[PDB]
Amino acid sequence: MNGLFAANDLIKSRKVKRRSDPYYRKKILGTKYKHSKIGNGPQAKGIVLEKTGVEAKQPNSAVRKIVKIQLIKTGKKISAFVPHDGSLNYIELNDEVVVEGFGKKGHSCGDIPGISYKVVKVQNVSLLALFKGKKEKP
């Protein structure tokens, strides 16, 4: 298809080959509006229901502490990972949390299986500061 007067056959052929790009295919179908887990935003809110732990994959061995919540914007149930040592003792049930993502394009990183979200705020108190000990929990 190399010719001087072949612009009509060149554009029609190169649009077909571009559809096999795995990043461009999701842009056409619009999957980020259809199958989004959290919506379209940086954070979210929720209500805690359980305080349970999971076990990491081989070859490491530990117990990772998580929490099963229910979102407000959509209404679905989801699990999030408590990201610091000794931080679950602040958390009580029937409370509110704020959820932030991991930063690996919608996948799970580390040896934590099937979980892609982590807690950042409890009762409008920063959990990063509360581990440092600057504030106190009401």
Binding site: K51, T52, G53, E55, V63, K65, D85, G86, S87, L88, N89
Partner: protein, 56 residues
């Protein structure tokens, strides 16, 4: 049959020693001045950075 009772075992167990107050650290171009004269005396520019700075 999963235990969550051992949450926060290590950090509450290690004993706390207090901080030691330090002089007020200089800030600004004088902070860059104290760092430049300290590097020039040990020949840090001549050996092309091949030494240990934090020595303890």
């Amino acid at each position: 049959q999963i235990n969550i009772k051992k949450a926060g075992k290590v950090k509450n167990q290690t004993p706390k020693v207090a901080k030691q107050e330090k002089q007020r650290a200089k800030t600004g171009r004088c902070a860059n001045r104290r760092k430049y004269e300290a590097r020039l005396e040990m020949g840090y520019f001549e050996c092309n950075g091949k030494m240990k700075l934090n020595l303890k």
